Structures are given as C-alpha cells and as structure tokens.
C-alpha cells in the first residue's frame, strides 16, 4: 500500500493553526469549505504525528500499544484520502465525509489507556530513568496535543453540520462551568468519602467590576481541566483532615485582565513538597499498575494558555488555569514536525 508515501507527502506541510475567530466563522462559511479545508488539513496533522511516531526507537515502536495506535492513524489517514478527488457539490460526498469523521473519532477513543500500557511496558522492560522520563514527556505532550487539535477539527465539523458553535460557546460563563465541575466532583467525593469540602467562588472583573465574566471558549475543555483539579483538591482536603472535624472549603477565583482570564483553585489539603510537583505532571512517574494533570495542562496550552501548580507543604495547593481573555489571542497551539531528536 501507500501509507508511508502519504505520510511522507503530507508531513511536508505545516499544520495550519486556527483562531477562535476562524472557528466561529466556519460555523455561521458553510459545509463545502469545511470539507475542502479538512480533507487537506487532517491528512497534514495525521501525517505530521505519524512521522514522529515512526522516529521512536525500535524497542518503543515495535511494542503492541504503539503498533496498535499507529494502525489506527494509518486507517484514519486512508479513510480521509478516499475524499480527495470527490466533488464537494455532491451532498452524498458531504454526508459520507461526516460519517467517516465519526468512525475515525470513535476508532481513536482508547488512545490514552493504550499509550499508558506502552509507558507501563517501557518502565518494566527498560526502566524509569530521568532521560526515559523526558523522552516520554516530550513525545506524549506532542502526541496528545496533536490529538486534542484533530478531535477539535472533527468535533467542529460533525456538530455544526448534522448560540453554541459546535464545541465553542462564544458567551461561556466561566463560574457556571466551575460550579458544574465542582458539583460533579462533590458527587464522587461524597460517594467515596463520608464528606466533601464546600465551594467558594470569587470573580474579579478588573475593567468591569461586578459584570459577570464571560469568554469565547470550548467549555468541555474547561470542564475537563476544572473537574481534574476539583478531584485532586477534594482528595487532598478530605484525606489530610480525616482526624480533624472542620473541612476547609475549596476557593476558586476567576480574574479577568486585559489579556488573561485566570482561574485559581486554592485548597488546604496539606500540600506537596516542591520535589514531588514535577512527578505530578510526568506521564512516566504518574503511570502505575497519560493522566489528568499533564493532559489538562495540554488543554490549557492548546489555545495559548497554561496550567500551573504551586503548593505549600503543610498547608495546601493552588492550581491556576491561564486562558487568553480575547478570541483574537486564542489560536491553536500545534506541535510541528521537522528538526527532531
Ligand atoms: C508512550 C510510549 C509508547 C513511549 C514509551 C517510551 C518512550 C521512550 O522513548 C525513548 C526512551 C529513551 C530514549 C533515549 C535514547 O536512546 N535516545 C535516542 C533514541 N534511540 C529515547 C526515547 Cl525516544 C516513548 C514513548
Ligand atoms: C497532596 N495533593 C495536593 O496537594 C494536590 C495536588 C494537585 C492538585 O491539583 C491539588 C492538590 O491539593 C495531591 C497529590 C496527588 C493527588 C492525586 N493526583 O491523586 C491529589 C492531591
Ligand atoms: Cl471546522
């Protein structure tokens, strides 16, 4: 077959990063333009990460988990090829493309636990030394960020072409998503432990005091990040206080600046020594017989944000999500192939 040829052809192109603005217009332009963009751009993004997978050393590349994930990418690339010569004016071309995108999305659903098996296998077969750790961290950050960007493109297409513009809410109420993610974490926390800390939210709209804080964002991404952080802050708070009676609340601040929308989650869960912070973000060190924090950080990075942890051992932990306030500064952050090693 031609998969290596295709990979070589499309890995010559740079992925084209889109802004929120571009994303919002695509969901007014129309389906034909999404189709002609995506039938080029998906092969480009697939091929760029496939090329990088093929550069892994043989002792990683040869493992069943990587071979299995590589086989999903090959089929998904081939599924998209079928449409390169098809006619955009034919509505059967367009419906079949949508169908093809849903199968591709479904096919890749189990990538994270599959890659996690790969990490486990490597720790036991070759070890968990600091250089292994950096190479795993380097690869998976790029792999998972690539995969977030491909799921975004596919989600935008399948949701728009069946107020919100697919996965984008142009009037996202940040405090409402905070309360949703808290309410869900509390539910699980109450079930597993006999208790759950309360929530306090404070907003700081610097320029418009007392105006509720809204942004253009992908609320499912924001939920994913906040949910992960709530789980961590609830587990720490409950477990560090199980001989105490009082349960300090979790305090969230939502700050809107000129360019940053910042969400701090402050807990009193006893904290982590500085030495152990790096490990919480490490796929390798956080793999035991992917993970929430490292992948939540990629969601934040995806539109030029970040996710930082600062703890005070003996007291508690601050987690901050940094987002861009402005749709104009919210541009896909994409890993690009070439330079290497
Ligand atoms: C996520 C899974 C599948 C996974 C598991 C393990 C790895 C680890 O990959 C390593 C490990 C060590 C080195 C040092 C070295 O030898 N450098 C030169 C390269 N030979 C390089 C790489 Cl790319 C990546 C991804
Ligand atoms: C102590 N501890 C923290 O202080 C802490 C870590 C991360 C976080 O977002 C919030 C925290 O309180 C903490 C550490 C690890 C987990 C975990 N991954 O299960 C949870 C909590
Ligand atoms: Cl789109």
Curated annotation (Swiss-Prot):
Q: Where along the chain is ATP bound?
A: 228-235, 267, 286-287, 290-293
CDD domains of this UniProt entry? HATPase_PDK-like (cd16929)
**Could you say which EC number(s) this protein's record lists?**
2.7.11.2
Coiled coil regions in record: none
Q: Any keyword Transit peptide? A: yes
Please report what switches on or represses expression of this protein.
Answer: Down-regulated by insulin. Up-regulated by reactive oxygen species and cigarette smoke extract. Up-regulated by PPARD.
The record's section on Pfam families has: BCDHK_Adom3, HATPase_c
Q: Which residues carry this modification: N6-succinyllysine?
A: 339
Going by the entry's taxonomy, the superkingdom of the source organism is recorded as Eukaryota
The GO terms describing molecular function are: ATP binding; protein homodimerization activity; protein kinase activity; pyruvate dehydrogenase (acetyl-transferring) kinase activity
Gene Ontology CC entries for this record: cytosol; mitochondrial matrix; mitochondrion; nucleoplasm; pyruvate dehydrogenase complex
Similarity field? Belongs to the PDK/BCKDK protein kinase family.
Assembly and interaction partners:
Homodimer, and heterodimer with PDK1. Interacts with the pyruvate dehydrogenase complex subunit DLAT, and is part of the multimeric pyruvate dehydrogenase complex that contains multiple copies of pyruvate dehydrogenase (E1), dihydrolipoamide acetyltransferase (DLAT, E2) and lipoamide dehydrogenase (DLD, E3).
Q: What is this protein called?
A: [Pyruvate dehydrogenase (acetyl-transferring)] kinase isozyme 2, mitochondrial
Species name: Homo sapiens (Human)
The taxonomy runs: Eukaryota, Metazoa, Chordata, Craniata, Vertebrata
